Write an enzyme that holds these catalytic residues in place. Structure first.
Site, PDB file in Angstrom:
ATOM      1  N   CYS A   8       0.842  -1.166   0.000  1.00 15.68           N
ATOM      2  CA  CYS A   8       0.000   0.000   0.000  1.00 15.68           C
ATOM      3  C   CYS A   8       0.891   1.235   0.000  1.00 15.68           C
ATOM      4  CB  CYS A   8      -1.018  -0.023   1.151  1.00 15.68           C
ATOM      5  SG  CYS A   8      -0.219  -0.031   2.819  1.00 15.68           S
ATOM      6  N   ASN A  11       2.406   1.430   4.061  1.00 16.88           N
ATOM      7  CA  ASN A  11       2.740   0.153   4.736  1.00 16.88           C
ATOM      8  C   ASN A  11       2.602   0.276   6.253  1.00 16.88           C
ATOM      9  OD1 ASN A  11       5.606  -2.061   5.191  1.00 16.88           O
ATOM     10  ND2 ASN A  11       3.574  -2.740   4.738  1.00 16.88           N
ATOM     11  N   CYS A  13      -1.118   0.780   7.465  1.00 14.15           N
ATOM     12  CA  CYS A  13      -2.496   0.373   7.723  1.00 14.15           C
ATOM     13  C   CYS A  13      -2.900  -0.840   6.869  1.00 14.15           C
ATOM     14  CB  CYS A  13      -3.510   1.516   7.538  1.00 14.15           C
ATOM     15  SG  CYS A  13      -3.142   3.058   8.440  1.00 14.15           S
ATOM     16  N   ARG A  14      -3.093  -0.637   5.574  1.00 10.04           N
ATOM     17  CA  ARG A  14      -3.762  -1.690   4.792  1.00 10.04           C
ATOM     18  C   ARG A  14      -2.878  -2.924   4.542  1.00 10.04           C
ATOM     19  NH1 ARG A  14      -5.366   2.138  -0.058  1.00 10.04           N
ATOM     20  NH2 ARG A  14      -3.375   3.039   0.743  1.00 10.04           N
ATOM     21  N   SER A  15      -1.676  -2.730   4.009  1.00 15.53           N
ATOM     22  CA  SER A  15      -0.868  -3.933   3.691  1.00 15.53           C
ATOM     23  C   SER A  15      -0.390  -4.737   4.943  1.00 15.53           C
ATOM     24  CB  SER A  15       0.295  -3.633   2.732  1.00 15.53           C
ATOM     25  OG  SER A  15       1.126  -2.538   3.189  1.00 15.53           O
ATOM     26  N   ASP A 125      -7.791   3.790   1.757  1.00 16.77           N
ATOM     27  CA  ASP A 125      -6.911   4.141   2.867  1.00 16.77           C
ATOM     28  C   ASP A 125      -7.766   4.557   4.082  1.00 16.77           C
ATOM     29  OD1 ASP A 125      -4.858   4.989   4.528  1.00 16.77           O
ATOM     30  OD2 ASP A 125      -4.141   6.602   3.177  1.00 16.77           O
TER      31      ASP A 125
END
Length: 153
Positions: A8, A11, A13-15, A125
């Site tokens: 993301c 690196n 939150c999402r990934s 995000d």
């Protein structure tokens, strides 16, 4: 073996969530030895940082945790991973740009969301949101990771 790199923008939150969830899933199915799993960022802004506290708490709500700290994607990653699964359109364009700059691009670069049974293509995000936004992302990651795993098998 098989390798997957979740990516993301930052690196944090999402990934890191997708990675922890995917790792949890293959560990439960006892196939974790057949996988190399990582996550990284398009940007270098957060390098060395553990994930956002909201991402950590979200994970903890589902009995999951991660020792990940943030790193930027490198040229070698494109040469190394079988799959690079990203979160949104801008990640996808950035990764497609970087891939044109590398000698050997082995990785298949795809939206994680393209595996969603519910067809929500984009995992947005949650950084500027609240805990519910992190929960939405978690649910998208889980279902995409399940489908990705089940498609391969």
């Amino acid at each position: 073996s098989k390798s997957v790199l979740f990516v993301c923008l930052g690196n944090i939150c999402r990934s890191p969530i997708a990675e922890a969830v995917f790792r949890k899933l293959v560990t439960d199915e006892k196939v974790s030895d057949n996988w190399a799993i990582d996550s990284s960022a398009v940007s270098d802004w957060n390098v060395g940082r553990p994930p956002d506290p909201r991402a950590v708490s979200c994970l903890r709500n589902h009995g999951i945790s991660t020792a990940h700290k943030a790193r930027q994607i490198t040229k070698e990653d494109f040469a190394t991973f079988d799959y690079i699964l990203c979160m949104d359109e801008s990640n996808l364009r950035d990764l497609n740009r970087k891939s044109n700059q590398v000698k050997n691009c082995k990785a298949k670069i795809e939206l994680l969301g393209s595996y969603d049974p519910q067809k929500q293509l984009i995992i947005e995000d949650p950084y500027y949101g609240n805990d519910s936004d992190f929960e939405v992302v978690y649910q998208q990651c889980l279902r995409c990771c399940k489908a990705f795993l089940e498609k391969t098998y």
